[PDB]
Amino acid sequence: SDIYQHFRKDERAFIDQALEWKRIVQEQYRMKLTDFLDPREQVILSAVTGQVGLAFSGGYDRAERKRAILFPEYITPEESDFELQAFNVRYADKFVSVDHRSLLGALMGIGLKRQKFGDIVFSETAVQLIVSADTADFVAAQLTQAGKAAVSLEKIDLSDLNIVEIRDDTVSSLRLDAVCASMSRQSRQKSQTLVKNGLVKVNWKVVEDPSYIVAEGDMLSIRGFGRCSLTKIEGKTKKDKWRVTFERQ
Amino acid sequence: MRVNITLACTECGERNYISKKNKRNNPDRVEFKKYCPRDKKSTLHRETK
């Protein structure tokens, strides 16, 4: 009841369900695997669960959408308890190209919910996707086209997964509106519109406060400029602006 | 920057000599052949660790 204040009002929905997962693992003494919780929902769950222990794995290390195991003080989990299936996306690579937008659009097009798949990995040699094992056969059967490319899915082990723009700058403050303006190369008044409407996120939390102070190692997500990361804050200049470093995706 | 140091007779262990070096210029333990008045002869005296 006195947890919601710490999160947003829309985020209440997840928090209610996150409390219902903790309820199970305490009383029934059994691990609860979840449906690839979003990077934000990782942060929320971590809080709602409390310290019921928690584990998280999205197949490869550095998956955005990862599935969480809520386990007690015993039954420390394995890599396959997360019920993850990796696939290699086969297509006529010489003729057609698959991009992240097309493959994401195709996954959604076959009716797959965002919670039923993790990250879509693009390397030089392979395009791979990670899904929940319960949906693996459905996705393999239905995902026959991505954009203009005819595609097929080959099952692989997680071990077979084939896993910047540094921009040293100065800002007046570490307010959100100031950092966005700097990163996105805009007027601050324009950046304030972005923040206020609800287009910027900070670690996948929608921050609508222009004056929110941004810390070192915060993934900002300006809808319109993509995504960028305050990696370094490096003291202050002669004329008193924060020496900073940005790295766009 | 430049720091205080002790040299110590590598024989008898007698902390015989303070001095100064620049650490950036001289980052590894300096040694010199300076008289130990315990031993009563020149010995190598190395910067104390």
Binding site: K190, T193, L194, N197, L199, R223, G224 | -
Partner: protein, 52 residues
């Protein structure tokens, strides 16, 4: 039909009045019928019926 700063679709009306001396080009919001700006301003002192 244009987009706003957030990316939402907005419709603007551009009125081009050919009235000699009083000719004007006026941009409005289509939803609110509110003048964004006009190439020539018309104060209430100049015209009691309509302000631009």
């Amino acid at each position: 039909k244009s987009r706003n700063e957030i990316g939402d679709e907005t419709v603007r009306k551009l009125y081009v009045e050919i009235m000699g001396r009083h000719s004007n080009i006026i941009l409005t919001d289509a939803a609110e019928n509110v003048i964004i700006d006009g190439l020539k301003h018309l104060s209430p002192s100049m015209n009691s019926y309509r302000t631009v």
